[PDB]
């Protein structure tokens, strides 16, 4: 399962 940091990184990469 992806880490929360990975989720946050993806958010900021695309916003």
């Amino acid at each position, epitope marked *: *399962l992806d*880490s*929360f*940091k990975e*989720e*946050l990184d993806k*958010y900021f990469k695309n*916003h």
Partner: antibody
Amino acid sequence: VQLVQSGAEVKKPGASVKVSCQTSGTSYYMHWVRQAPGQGLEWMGLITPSGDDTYYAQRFQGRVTMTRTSTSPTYMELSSLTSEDTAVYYCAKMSRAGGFDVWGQGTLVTVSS
Amino acid sequence: EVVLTQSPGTLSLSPGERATLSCRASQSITGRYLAWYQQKPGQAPRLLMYGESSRVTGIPDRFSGGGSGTDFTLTISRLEPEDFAVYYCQHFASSPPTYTFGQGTKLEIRR
């Protein structure tokens, strides 16, 4: 990682306050959380490991700014202060799992006439 | 946004007894997005556990938890004096980034 914040502040309504958070000595997502005397915890927002972007809690959007160069302390500035902003302000490091694993010692900000 | 409601407001138990602390989310969540904290007077909170009972380094075995959907529990099985404190749950989301906290449960010594 140990987090050391700046000292307590006293402010009049309408002023602003700027608190610093320094890693004593990898960069990490840094968050700010405040706690009014005798009350619970309230998240304010976060800043990315590089400092290139932020995201704030809805209640503070338009009033708060979080800044970091790269290896400079990180700051939280809160404007248009009222007595409701009296609280201890904490900075915190996020772990990869999303919880706050290291906390600063807190900075008391008192807002009063 | 997710809203967290903790119960009870105050829990009064004796050393050696088992404490059950509840956190209810306003919508169904995966417990990976819930964390528990301990806070004592004069101190910053301390991270304990995620919603799925996964403890962080240095947290004793007597701390456990469980849940799925809207209801989550932190269980402290054989209370020690150092366990009496205020406990908060926390939920986090990444899109858009949003954290929230429950209002806290005070775990106090019954004598």
